[PDB]
C-alpha cells in the first residue's frame, strides 16, 4: 500500500496522521482517494471518499483544524477555482460561503488563527475589483484566459463561513505564488515565492491580531530565493524550511530553520542532500519530526522529463 507519485498535492496533519490528497504527475491523481500516513508506524492507508468530492486538482490550499480538513482553491483540468470544501475525518462537503470569495487561484498559502482561516496570495484569474489588494498579470499567460499573481488577504470565518478582507497596515509583500506560509501564535509568516521574473528570498509576517505587515531582515546568511518550498512550524520559536526551486531553475535540497527569537537562519544538516524536492509537502509530527512527501526531484517545467516522487523524507529536528 503506497500512494502514487505526485507534486502539487496537499498534506495536512494532526501530529499523528498525515492526510494526503490530489496533485498531478507525468495527469491529475484520482479525486476520490484520500491517503493517510501514520507518522508513528510508517504505514499508509487509502480510503475512498464520497459527498461533494472536489475535482482532481494541483495547487489547492488545505488545513487540518480539530480533525476537520478544509480545502480551498487549486487547478483542475478546466482551470483555477475558488470553491471551498470541508472533510470531517468519508464525506466531502462543498460549503457555499457568504461574502465575496477570493478570486479563483492556486499555489497560495493559509494561516489558521482561532476561528479564522486566512489566505494569502496565489496565481489565477483576474478578480472582480471588489477585492482589495493588488493583482499583476503574468504576461506569458496571454500566449497560453490570462492569469497573474495577487497579494490579497482573505478571511474565511469558520463561525459563519463568511468571507471578508481585513484592512491591513504596513507594507504587504509583493503579489506572489508558490510562497510558503507558516503560523506561530498570532504571526502569519510568509517566505519567498515567485513574482514576475524572480523566485524570492524575502521574509514577512502579518500580525493576525492587529493586521499589521512586518518585513523581517535576518542578520547574516539567508537561504537562496525560491518557490515551491515548504516552511513548517516545529516549535513556538522555529520554522523549518526545505527544498524548492531557484530563479535559475535549480532544484533544492538544503534545509534550514528560522529561529524567530534570534531572527536568524540556521542551515540544517541532513542525509537527503541528493534528494532535492519541489512542490512537495511537509508536516510536523508530535515527536519533533518533519515528514516530507511527494514533489519533484528536477525541473518539473520540462514535463516529459519530470521526476515526481512518492518518497517520504523524515527530518529529525
Amino acid at each position: 500500500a503506497c500512494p502514487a507519485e505526485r507534486s502539487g498535492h496537499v498534506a495536512v496533519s494532526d501530529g499523528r496522521h498525515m492526510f494526503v490528497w490530489g496533485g498531478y504527475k507525468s495527469f491529475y491523481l484520482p479525486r476520490e482517494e484520500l491517503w493517510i500516513y501514520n507518522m508513528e508506524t510508517g504505514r499508509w492507508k487509502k480510503i475512498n471518499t464520497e459527498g461533494d468530492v472536489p475535482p482532481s486538482m494541483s495547487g489547492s490550499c488545505a488545513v487540518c483544524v480539530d480533525r476537520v480538513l478544509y480545502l480551498f482553491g487549486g487547478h483542475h483540468s478546466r482551470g483555477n477555482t475558488n470553491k471551498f470544501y470541508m472533510l470531517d475525518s468519508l464525506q466531502w462537503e462543498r460549503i457555499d460561503c457568504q461574502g465575496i470569495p477570493p478570486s479563483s487561484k492556486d499555489k497560495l498559502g493559509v494561516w489558521v488563527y482561532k476561528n479564522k482561516l486566512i489566505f494569502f496570495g496565489g496565481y489565477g484569474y483576474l478578480p472582480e475589483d471588489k477585492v482589495l489588494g493588488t493583482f499583476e498579470f503574468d504576461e506569458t499567460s496571454f500566449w497560453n484566459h490570462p492569469r497573474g499573481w495577487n497579494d490579497h488577504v482573505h478571511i474565511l470565518d469558520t463561525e459563519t463561513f463568511t468571507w471578508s478582507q481585513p484592512i491591513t497596515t504596513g507594507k504587504a509583500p509583493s503579489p506572489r505564488a508558490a510562497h510558503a506560509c507558516a503560523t506561530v501564535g498570532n504571526r502569519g509568516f510568509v517566505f519567498g515565492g515567485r513574482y514576475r521574473d524572480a523566485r524570492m528570498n524575502d521574509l514577512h509576517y502579518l500580525n493576525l491580531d492587529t493586521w499589521e505587515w512586518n518585513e523581517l531582515i535576518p542578520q547574516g546568511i539567508c537561504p537562496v530565493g525560491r518557490s515551491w518550498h515548504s516552511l513548517t512550524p516545529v516549535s513556538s520559536d522555529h520554522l523549518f524550511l526545505f527544498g524548492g526551486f531557484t530563479t535559475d531553475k535549480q532544484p533544492l535540497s538544503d534545509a534550514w530553520t528560522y529561529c524567530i527569537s534570534k531572527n536568524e537562519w540556521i542551515q540544517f544538516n541532513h542525509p537527503y542532500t541528493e534528494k532535492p524536492r519541489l512542490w512537495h509537502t511537509a508536516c510536523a509530527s508530535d515527536e519533533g519530526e518533519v515528514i516530507v512527501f511527494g514533489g519533484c526531484a528536477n525541473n518539473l517545467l520540462v514535463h516529459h522529463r519530470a521526476a515526481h516522487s512518492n518518497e517520504i523524507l523524515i527530518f529529525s529536528v
Binding site: 495527469f27 505564488a177 517545467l301
Partner: peptide, 7 residues
C-alpha cells in the same frame, strides 16, 4: 503545462 504556470 497550466498547473505549474506562475510558480
Amino acid at each position: 503545462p497550466p498547473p505549474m504556470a506562475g510558480g
